[PDB]
Amino acid sequence: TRTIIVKFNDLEDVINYAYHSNPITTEFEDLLYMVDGTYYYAVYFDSHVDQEVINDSYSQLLEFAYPTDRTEVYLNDYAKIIMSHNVTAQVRRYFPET
Amino acid sequence: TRTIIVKFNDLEDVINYAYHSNPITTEFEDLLYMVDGTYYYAVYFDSHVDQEVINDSYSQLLEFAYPTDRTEVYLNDYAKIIMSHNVTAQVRRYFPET
Amino acid sequence: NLKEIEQEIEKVKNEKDAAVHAQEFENAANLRDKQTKLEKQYEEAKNEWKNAQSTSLSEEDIAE
Amino acid sequence: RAQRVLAHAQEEAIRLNHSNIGTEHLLLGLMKEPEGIAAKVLESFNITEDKVIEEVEKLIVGTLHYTPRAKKVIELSMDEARKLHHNFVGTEHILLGLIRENEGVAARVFANLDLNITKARAQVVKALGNPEMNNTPTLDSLARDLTVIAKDGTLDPVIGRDKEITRVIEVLSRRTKNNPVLIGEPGVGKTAIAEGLAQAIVNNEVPETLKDKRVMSLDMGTVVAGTKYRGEFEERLKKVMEEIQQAGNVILFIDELHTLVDASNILKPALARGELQCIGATTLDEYRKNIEKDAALERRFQPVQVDE
Amino acid sequence: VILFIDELHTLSNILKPALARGELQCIGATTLDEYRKNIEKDAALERRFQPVQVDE
Amino acid sequence: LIGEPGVGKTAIAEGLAQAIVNNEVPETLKDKRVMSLDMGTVVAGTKYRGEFEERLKKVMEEIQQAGN
Numbered sequence A, B: 001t002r003t004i005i006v007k008f009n010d011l012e013d014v015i016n017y018a019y020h021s022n023p024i025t026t027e028f029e030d031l032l033y034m035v036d037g038t039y040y041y042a043v044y045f046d047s048h049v050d051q052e053v054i055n056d057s058y059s060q061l062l063e064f065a066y067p068t069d070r071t072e073v074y075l076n077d078y079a080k081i082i083m084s085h086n087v088t089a090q091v092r093r094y095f096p097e098t
Numbered sequence C: 001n002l003k004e005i006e007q008e009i010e011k012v013k014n015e016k017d018a019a020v021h022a023q024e025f026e027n028a029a030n031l032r033d034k035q036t037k038l039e040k041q042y043e044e045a046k047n048e049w050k051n052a053q054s055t056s057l058s059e060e061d062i063a064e
Numbered sequence D: 001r002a003q004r005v006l007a008h009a010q011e012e013a014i015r016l017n018h019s020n021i022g023t024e025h026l027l028l029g030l031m032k033e034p035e036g037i038a039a040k041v042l043e044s045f046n047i048t049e050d051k052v053i054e055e056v057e058k059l060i061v062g063t064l065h066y067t068p069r070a071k072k073v074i075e076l077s078m079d080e081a082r083k084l085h086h087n088f089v090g091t092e093h094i095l096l097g098l099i100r101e102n103e104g105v106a107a108r109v110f111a112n113l114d115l116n117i118t119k120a121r122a123q124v125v126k127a128l129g130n131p132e133m134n135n136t137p138t139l140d141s142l143a144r145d146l147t148v149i150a151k152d153g154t155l156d157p158v159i160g161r162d163k164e165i166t167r168v169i170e171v172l173s174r175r176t177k178n179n180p181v182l183i184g185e186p187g188v189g190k191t192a193i194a195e196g197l198a199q200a201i202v203n204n205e206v207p208e209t210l211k212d213k214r215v216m217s218l219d220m221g222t223v224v225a226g227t228k229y230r231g232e233f234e235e236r237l238k239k240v241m242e243e244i245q246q247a248g249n250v251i252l253f254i255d256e257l258h259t260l261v262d263a264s265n266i267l268k269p270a271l272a273r274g275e276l277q278c279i280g281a282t283t284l285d286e287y288r289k290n291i292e293k294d295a296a297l298e299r300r301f302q303p304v305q306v307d308e
Numbered sequence E: 001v002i003l004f005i006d007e008l009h010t011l012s013n014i015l016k017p018a019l020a021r022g023e024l025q026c027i028g029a030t031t032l033d034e035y036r037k038n039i040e041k042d043a044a045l046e047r048r049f050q051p052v053q054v055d056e
Numbered sequence F: 001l002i003g004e005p006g007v008g009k010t011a012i013a014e015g016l017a018q019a020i021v022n023n024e025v026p027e028t029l030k031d032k033r034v035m036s037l038d039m040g041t042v043v044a045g046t047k048y049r050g051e052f053e054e055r056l057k058k059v060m061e062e063i064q065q066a067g068n
């Protein structure tokens, strides 16, 4: 699948990934969802990206967050979109480093 | 295998082997390890020494020593090298007769 | 009162092992010779003990 | 312990110029220390340093911190040290922690290099293992062993009860009625006498006769499980008895001996025959009211007074 | 873990593997009638259990 | 054997057994087995109905068959 989701317990973990992670030099589209305070990170890859970069990212998120416990359909239903197409840039611009 | 490891409960057994044993006129390299007071004896034969001679020497070792209770990897990690490349000779030259 | 030899035997053996653990072989041989001497003295003490190792039941032992 | 891998982690982070310290860095450090058990075990699976370096480079300042997954891996490795390896943690514990947490860049490298997880765990266990690969089950369950506690050193010391301990020692050395009874008010130290006897046994103070005899406190809490079934408690009493018989090195401490004097007809032949040696603790009033009345119990037990 | 067992009187030698040496910390509760009858009459329970009277 | 405690009744039974072993008894008791039975052992583990009677009956039948 080209749609992954990971689970950030707190916005501190999101800030940690935005600052201290150097993701693979790849192009992708990022959306941030929130339900009951839990942050869900959804990134969508175009038709030219390999699943190896996807597992590497899912591990860096896994190095900063947890695997998703909610399906994509459930998040598209009940989760409020918080950020789209720019996650790291906007948290870096607003939030400072830990 | 090319590595023979035997365990000496005490130093007296090491001296007993050093003086009272008559190994086959073979070429080998020997080291003496020590963990928790227990002594371990390792002998490495050349590539040209046959396996039957290895087993023969191992069974000659068992007269004065017990079969090893720790693997070679654990010994190389944790055990301290007490003597190198000449165990019988150095034990004989340092400690006197029983 | 023979206990005053076992403790020094234990101390000498522990010092023996600690000394050989540090690749100090001359001190090791000296300590081993001392340990052998102390072990022989302890064996001699045990020998005098078993030589001292008869008691009879008297009328007073029963009166008590 | 081997902290040089943790020391590597920063150095390899600078060398690769990464902004974090991940599980792949820890794997690179395990490679950096060839002496390690983890390095040898992973080398046995043809997983060597240059291949790991190439895989990490294919896969993946100053504010470098261990990623939450790296911290989780370290915590798991400490928890894996609960394999009776005390506080000290080694490289193979770290490798086992990485194996258990099959998530992260290290897990991705293992999958990419086709390394089996269960086989690696078995290899580590065998490397840590031993290459070369009587008892009273019921008594050890319903009774409290005092000699093992004394050997462990957890038993509290006994002070000043030298005369009582010597009296117990000389009573136990008799041929016919070698069963002492400790008579005293509650809370004076009657159980402390048995504990001190166990300490003397451990400290090699007892004579040659009691040199290697265990002191097992037969707690009489619920040995009488059911008072209505015929023989339900008699059966387990007989079982405890023949277990004590088959291993003739068990001294038995029975607190509140007067509660058992239902079991008189079973304990009487064994005590009179010499298969069981017993130490009892009772009160003077209870002793006079129960044990002194029966002449059969007097022909077995010898009173010892424990004073406040 | 601190173990709580209500109706303690419904429960010694069932649980000495953690009560003889105090491995289980019993924090149970019972009435005075069910305490004097079977808890006060036991030697092992007197060694470990301490009566905490609960007031009206 | 009737007597005060500690007079030697069990000693009397043991002496009879020793006389059997040393063979100083009449011919009718030359090779008899003196077997000491404790009733607490017989009653041990007898919760269900009829088990004690069954055990005692088997013991008696064995005594009758052996005859010694």
Ligand SMILES: Nc1ncnc2c1ncn2[C@@H]1O[C@H](COP(=O)(O)OP(=O)(O)O)[C@@H](O)[C@H]1O
Residues within 6 Å of the ligand: D156, D157, D158, D159, D160, D161, D185, D186, D187, D188, D189, D190, D191, D192, D281
């Ligand atoms: N002589 C002694 N030396 C050390 N501790 C003692 C001594 N006598 C009693 N104690 C302590 O005081 C407590 C008293 O309990 P104890 O008198 O043994 O109960 P019981 O008399 O019912 O056997 C024990 O837990 C023991 O630790």
Ligand SMILES: [Mg+2]
Residues within 6 Å of the ligand: F009, F010
């Ligand atoms: Mg009798």
